[PDB]
Amino acid sequence: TDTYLHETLVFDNKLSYIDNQRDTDGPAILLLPGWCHDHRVYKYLIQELDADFRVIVPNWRGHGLSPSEVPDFGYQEQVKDALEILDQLGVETFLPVSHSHGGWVLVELLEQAGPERAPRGIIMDWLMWAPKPDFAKSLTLLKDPERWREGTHGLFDVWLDGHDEKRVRHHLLEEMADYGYDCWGRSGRVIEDAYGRNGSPMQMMANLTKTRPIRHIFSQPTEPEYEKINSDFAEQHPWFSYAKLGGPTHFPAIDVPDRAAVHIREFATAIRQG
Template sequence: MNTLTLHGHPLDHDVTGSAGPTLLLLSGWCQDHRLFDPLVPLLAGAHRVIRADWRGHGADRSPVADFGYAEQAEDLVALLDALDVDRVVPVSTSHGGWAALELADRLGSDRVPRVAVIDWLQLEAPAAFLADLRAGQAPELWALGRQRLFDTWLDGADCPPVAEHLSRDMASFGFEMWARSCWVIEAAYAHWGSPLARMAALREQRPILHLYSQPAEDAYHLAQLAFSAEQPWYRAQWLGGRTHFPTLESPAALARHLAEFAR
């Protein structure tokens, strides 16, 4: 990974490939670029692929002052400017989507003509999820709340790459970053209501694609279909996997849909 200091923080990133549309791969909180290891080789032949770690998420894990998706978007603007990227399709995972939409609003539809989001809870946050977010902010409960989320995201699947990602990568982040992620995500739902509502509030509409496996419930599928009927710029595609991590569980299917969308 290469490192640039942006807004006083080191930001790790790498660039693979050179031809075709530029894709900016963004993880969720308490993850890093390794989430996309299986996906990059599948995309780089026809795309310029940029991976970027959030501040405090790269090789330097020194404590950082509190930040949220607004600061994440500021870092991304600075990174894209430094790399002379004039047009980009953000591809965000989970709650990295809040920053991806903020980036789209800041740069406009000419520079960010479309956005892809991966396995991001699109509706209002369920009570159980909010309870886990609040547990994640309590020093005596955060590890339990995190484990409940890990169990939900794995869903008992026999998928070693996902199990390793949870135990090796996500579990390497301690209470400070985990608590920060939980309150930022909780505050985003409180402010916007849902990611779908945030998308509808974009200053300029553009195509948005949601690729997901969880939750695999009819009501969730139908709610997104109903939203798409009212907002034809939005499309959701269920991938049929078990876990919260299609980049690790279903990279070939994910790459196929992303390549089609970017074209």
């Protein structure tokens, strides 16, 4: 699976990316990481999809097996990076699939690339409402150079949700262990800025120039009030659907990869029949 790992120069920066280079019918599946992790979060998902789809995973600036400090940037830049990697690859039509706050990239990608290129989107486990106090606090801590690690530890708590989930723990404790304050502090300001200026993920999605099929697939928050904002948005919007996957953690791509795959396929197959 590092057998698909590549590095290319994208404007200023060298970025790593996964590309299985599969020669198959489109669309391509663009798996989009959230903040301060990389393609390793998708390694099980890649396996499920590897045969039948071409699978691309861009790593953001300063992200990868070897994280590095980079100048400040936000989701608009993540979007340009992703498209530039797609140009270099000669990829025309893609189905993007985001994790958590990678979603801001996904929704702006849908806008900029438009519905012929990007006709649908899948968002995984992305907090649909405006920050509640506990999350607002976590962001506060991530931005603070004295308390960022404390910041991350509280998020890991929420994310594992009282589960001894071996794979998810491995991702958080090992695969993200090399990411420092330059990333985490940035994630904090970019996400906080994103809610502030777009209201919420749902406000941002509803505001698309060309609305199109988007599904939210999630396991947490587990509470009925959260399912209800998702059911109410879906009642109000024909193009929106959701599925509650019932996995243990914030990372369905890791802990229920078969299930995430089944929704990606469904949306892939809908693109294949006009």
